Subunit: 317 residues, 4 copies
Amino acid sequence: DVNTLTRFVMEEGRKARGTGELTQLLNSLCTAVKAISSAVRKAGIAHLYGIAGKLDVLSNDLVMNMLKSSFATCVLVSEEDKHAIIVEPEKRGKYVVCFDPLDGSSNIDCLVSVGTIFGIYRKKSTDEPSEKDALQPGRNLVAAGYALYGSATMLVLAMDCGVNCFMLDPAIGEFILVDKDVKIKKKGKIYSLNEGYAKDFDPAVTEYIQRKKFPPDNSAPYGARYVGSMVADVHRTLVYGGIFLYPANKKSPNGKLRLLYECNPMAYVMEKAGGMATTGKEAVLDVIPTDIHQRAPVILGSPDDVLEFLKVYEKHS
Amino acid sequence: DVNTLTRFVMEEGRKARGTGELTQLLNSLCTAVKAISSAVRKAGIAHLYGIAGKLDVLSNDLVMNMLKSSFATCVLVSEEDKHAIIVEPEKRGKYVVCFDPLDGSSNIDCLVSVGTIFGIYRKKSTDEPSEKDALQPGRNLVAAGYALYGSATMLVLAMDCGVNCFMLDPAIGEFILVDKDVKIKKKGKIYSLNEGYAKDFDPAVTEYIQRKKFPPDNSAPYGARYVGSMVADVHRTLVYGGIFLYPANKKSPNGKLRLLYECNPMAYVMEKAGGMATTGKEAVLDVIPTDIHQRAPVILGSPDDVLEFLKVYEKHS
Amino acid sequence: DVNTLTRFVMEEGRKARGTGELTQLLNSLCTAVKAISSAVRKAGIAHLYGIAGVKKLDVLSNDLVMNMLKSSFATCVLVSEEDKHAIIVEPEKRGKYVVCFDPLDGSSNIDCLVSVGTIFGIYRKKSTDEPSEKDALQPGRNLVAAGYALYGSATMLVLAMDCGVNCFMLDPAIGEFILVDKDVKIKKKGKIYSLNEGYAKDFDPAVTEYIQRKKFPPDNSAPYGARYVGSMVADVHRTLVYGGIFLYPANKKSPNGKLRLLYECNPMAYVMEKAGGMATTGKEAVLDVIPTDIHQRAPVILGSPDDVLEFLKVYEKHS
Amino acid sequence: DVNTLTRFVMEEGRKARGTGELTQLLNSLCTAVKAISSAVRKAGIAHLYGIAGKLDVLSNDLVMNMLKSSFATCVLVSEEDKHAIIVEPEKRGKYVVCFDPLDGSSNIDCLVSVGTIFGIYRKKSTDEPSEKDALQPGRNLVAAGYALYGSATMLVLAMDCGVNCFMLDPAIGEFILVDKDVKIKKKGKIYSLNEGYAKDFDPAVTEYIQRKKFPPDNSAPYGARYVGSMVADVHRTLVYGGIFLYPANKKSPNGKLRLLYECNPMAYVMEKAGGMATTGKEAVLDVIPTDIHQRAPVILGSPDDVLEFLKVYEKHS
Ligand SMILES: CCc1cccc(S(=O)(=O)NC(=O)Nc2ncc(Br)s2)c1
Ligand SMILES: CCc1cccc(S(=O)(=O)NC(=O)Nc2ncc(Br)s2)c1
Ligand SMILES: CCc1cccc(S(=O)(=O)NC(=O)Nc2ncc(Br)s2)c1
Ligand SMILES: CCc1cccc(S(=O)(=O)NC(=O)Nc2ncc(Br)s2)c1
């Protein structure tokens, strides 16, 4: 039987007997994602080039506007905005949403994969809505995931029931369920980081990477892939297994990737898929944030791969 | 003035006062790319998952069939076919076309960019058409390029007049000229190869890459990117500068990429762009082929970077 | 604020503290409407014509709607123009609603790209017995919801409920129905009558006189204009938009008219009524007829109440 | 073999040994139509309605700009413009085009089919183009036809070789040849006119209409279809056969429809399809015009039906 994003969400929302507010949030977000995908694929570009004689900003406005008018949100955190956005009182709801509306978009000149990443929280405090409401650890997420604008557009959604993958059929504008309750492989064959920072790598990374190229047990060396767009790298890791790394470096000593709307949502998908995400020091999901734009170092992927990296981080204290 | 691939090619064609064949060819191919692109983006997928109750094969068929029926070709060589296809007599025209109908289709599962790569020759003799008509050095190319099915669909076309980029507007099914006469940067800041296979690297490759990561002077190291899909990696090299390698090693003395429909069309675009393309021993475009599926090594991109590769290469020769 | 069909239905769903079954059902129907539009616009026809070198459109339309409603878990009995009997949803997929629909009306004329459409009527199951065809034999008055999709120059979903009639435009770029006209109301009096005058020899005497009065008025005002697309959905939607009258009346040869009561007449009557207009057979309200055959026919006269009433003045004058 | 509008026009142009000018023109036109189709089907309408926080005027803009930039035209006559447009001298070409860019537009509220009507002339001489170049009888058309934005989008193209019908496939944005060398039925069974104005009819119209409803020879009454949108009624008359009328009453002695860009193209399609078009007094194509915006009565469709009307019109003297 055929399933869609909306029908999936309505069905699962009826099992748990909720008010429907998360369903409205998510419906709204799906719609924003379809409009982003449409713009990303360059629909209507002829009109820009005179046939009748900014993208990250548009995607931001799209997510924001849809999320506000879903009536389901109170605090909104975006990659694009300096401060948390506080929903006007009349449109206030119970969820806090952190998001990057178009990740990878600095590199989009070369039509690299891009995507949208989100995490949704139930507002915890009873105080007036503020920036602090977004500062919960990722263990708390109610729902998270991403859309990938690749060769095709795919929505990956993780909740309590696991991870589910919806392909956007552009002919009808519907997300179609194509991969149910997805589990990552226990062990992969591909490793992912920007090796151009090799000079700055601390010795645990350097040893770990060295083991992938020169396995110490005469197994086959891991292949390397780095699109350098977060959504594409994590998704491949999800689909094929392996390991994704963005550790700290001299230019980025607290990591480079953001915790709230990059590392947390991706960590959440990984764990729900049966995988791992770590900073090296702890799980990413357990990091208790202090600033909405703070960075985090991240290693994530197949459990045997992240474990084997943690042993090496262990070897170096 | 708004320009399209069609209007563009008709403009150039009339200037040259040619018969029109090449124009008919390009238009045919173009129509194939839109069809490929629509399927890559998964139009109609709802029907597959049972709403009302292969991609490599499809793309090959679209290209094959559209070329045959352009009345402009006589020998067609494809990644997908063992032998060269000889167009039926009443459909024969003057050109030979070497193509990869969907490059990177191997990894489409992770929705990594895929592409179509093409190379167009004029048949040289009045002989009965055979595989041998495709065995031309890349220098004899009349036109070449690729379609990238990435975050948007773009068609890069190289001819004598240089290299032009058209973005497909999906609203109206036209490729729109968006980048005129593109030239690659003299010197890039990015290197691109599978570093997972370092233990089998050629020692020249070993050393060159080490200088990118560990520069002896006081320069900033190169950033690393490797999509693992040629059209994407070559296209990012074009737009931002840098170097892409798929080189020889002792296990694979002649590399892995196919000369006819991968390396030559890429070498062609890069040279028209004012970039370089080499096997280490010689320019990619000067290799005389003896087998339609023969492999070539390729190092390509910004001229300063390729020249620097060659310097190290020679240090090891 | 931007409103879409899915946000609209959920927002009304919540207000009413419902289970969401009707919401799931409409979503499913709307998904089906989007897949019919795509097919109707001929997306993918190049393949049909050997570009790399099957199903007919009303058939496809039928399978799309059937399948979308079945799998919505909100239906128990389905009645479609295409099938002789009612479909009884398999137990594991049973819900509380009965749906009558014409999946692709006017498709007999798809060869000339005339506007086509999907008409639907939604009913609550009234008995406690195992579901059956009888559950579809409800008067129009019992409708929970009705409407249509018009596949014209653009695709629109006109949805009628207790709260009124809402019109949603399909944005093909994103696959979303956008609310473009809220709480829509027909004019009190139009300037357009609509029927097939080519069959004038066969008109009811009442129909002959009324049409004659619209062409040559005794009060000598301006005559009405004529429009007849030949597609119900298109003719009925124009009527709703520009006001006037649409007639597919009875005659000696066809004394119960020709259009089907359950999935053409009733739903167009309900939309008309929720929009402050009128639908009649001459003898009764379309919505009041108690059906006895799911494929039964009714005569239908609808539109501006000043126009319809005016037809009844003539109708009653001919008894 | 599959055929497209571009491919078909190219091969007919090559046949005729022409210079490519009319092909360039038709492609610019075809492109504009795709852009008109797209906006008429309401792509982007969510953006108008505030998702991120005219149509006849736009359509005219698209045809206008696409024809200017085609360099194939010199005089443009549009329904939307009081005086003819003279193309600026660098874009000047040898053709004159009269068009209705969006027929039926003032009734687009009820989403009635709309269309674009066009007909194309050779310029009259080197004499710096003027409004005069448009004042030519229908017989001088080189090509004509319409695009109908119906349940799907169809382009109908009439030329010396006959009438061919192309279906716009929105997935790939390409016009597919679906009906070759179309001929109208000798006699149909449908008549088409605003019967609402029966009061004002010519006795000949009245009598002819009388014969349709009440055959004196016993036969079946004709059906009546009237959409109120010229392209849709004319297209129904082409596909199914029958008769379309918009004739002269003593109030509109020369009809209502316009000659240059409504009656002529449709009459030229009709004659090329083996049917007829008349004012009653003469053929439509034979009228010599003296104003770009003058009207003309028109009766067109299947020959047997048109001859029937005439036979009656001649009875009424
Ligand atoms: C899958 C998302 C999800 C999962 C669990 C709960 C909820 S919820 O938003 O809190 N309640 C909800 O959707 N109730 C509904 N009743 C009827 C319909 Br139709 S939807 C959402
Ligand atoms: C840029 C494509 C190109 C470049 C060089 C030559 C040719 S050609 O195909 O050999 N000649 C050609 O197309 N002539 C034309 N005549 C009329 C039209 Br409209 S186009 C094409
Ligand atoms: C607008 C149609 C409509 C009107 C009234 C009632 C219903 S209903 O289907 O019976 N209830 C319903 O949807 N409740 C909901 N709870 C949560 C969400 Br999200 S929706 C539908
Ligand atoms: C089919 C329209 C038509 C019919 C007859 C003549 C012409 S034309 O415009 O004068 N010449 C033309 O198209 N020449 C071409 N040469 C090569 C190509 Br590729 S196209 C057009």
